[PDB]
């Protein structure tokens, strides 16, 4: 499937050139089947593409962890921009979570002090 | 715990010329790396990143940290037209640390997209 490579590529391709990025892989990425890898790649593409430049320098931190399940967590320390992540990209993350029998959360810290997107799905379901 | 992941991210963010795009990637069990080697890894990243310059075109520095049989730190710079970049005393410093840690160092340059690759590695014990 080449999952690790596809995720690094999606980040390089889709992250606004004004953002710093950091991607960590944890656990056996090989354990992910081709259909779920397809989901994982699209999820990272959606999250990263929807990130925008902020008033100050900011980083998107992506963590892709395969352990009991597959867990993709994107942390954005950029502030403000209340419309960031709220549109069709969010529809698509929720739809992909539903297709995969998984879960999606978007959470924004006090006065928009950073945002976390977490998409998870069972490895087998 | 060494806080290796966080310290590498901070080294890049803090020491990269602010005109460069940065991308950090992590693979393997980072927690396995000892405190002394984590100290080395951090210093290697700061030195390498601090030596990157602005090119005539926009450019990206990608730092990949991989833990398997050994610790491997690869800095890829797609910038062109600065053949003096990364040569000089910063390279001696990297080679010195490689020698001290019982590891290897490579500096490779080629035409096209992966213009320069700096690779520093050291055994875990
Ligand atoms: Zn953002
Ligand atoms: Zn350069």
From Swiss-Prot, chain A:
Subunit structure: The isolated histidine kinase core (HKC, residues 386-578) is a dimer and autophosphorylates, suggesting the protein may function as a homodimer.
Gene: devS
Residues of the full protein shown: 454 to 578 of 578
Organism field: Mycobacterium tuberculosis (strain ATCC 25618 / H37Rv)
Protein name, UniProt field: Oxygen sensor histidine kinase response regulator DevS/DosS
Phenotype when the gene is knocked out: Cells lacking this gene show no changes in gene induction following hypoxia, or exposure to NO or CO. Another publication shows a severely attenuated response to CO. Cells lacking both this gene and DosT have no response to hypoxia, or exposure to NO or CO showing both proteins are required for the hypoxic, NO and CO responses. 95% decreased induction of the DevR (DosR) regulon during anaerobic growth, 50% decreased induction of the DevR regulon upon exposure to NO during aerobic growth.
Additional remark text: Was identified as a high-confidence drug target.
Residues covered by region (ATP-binding domain): 1-125
Record localization: Cytoplasm
Functional summary from the UniProt entry: Member of the two-component regulatory system DevR/DevS (DosR/DosS) involved in onset of the dormancy response. Regulates an approximately 48-member regulon. Required for full induction of the DevR (DosR) regulon; acts later than DosT to positively regulate expression of the DevR regulon during adaptation to anaerobiosis. Characterized as an oxygen sensor; O(2) acts as a switch, with O(2)-bound Fe(2+) protein inactive in autophosphorylation. Has also been suggested to act as a redox sensor, or perhaps as a dual oxygen/redox sensor.
Span of the signal peptide: none
């Amino acid at each position: 499937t080449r999952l690790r490579q596809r995720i690094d590529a999606a980040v390089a391709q889709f992250a606004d050139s004004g953002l710093r990025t950091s991607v960590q892989f944890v656990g056996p990425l090989s354990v992910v089947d081709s259909a779920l890898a397809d989901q994982a790649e699209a999820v990272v593409r959606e999250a990263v593409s929807n990130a925008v430049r902020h008033a100050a320098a900011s980083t998107l931190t992506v963590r892709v962890k395969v352990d009991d399940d597959l867990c993709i967590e994107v942390t954005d320390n950029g502030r403000g921009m209340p419309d960031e992540f709220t549109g069709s990209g969010l529809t698509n993350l929720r739809q992909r979570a539903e297709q995969a029998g998984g879960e999606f959360t978007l959470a924004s810290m006090p006065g928009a002090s950073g945002t976390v997107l977490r998409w998870s799905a069972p490895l087998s379901q």
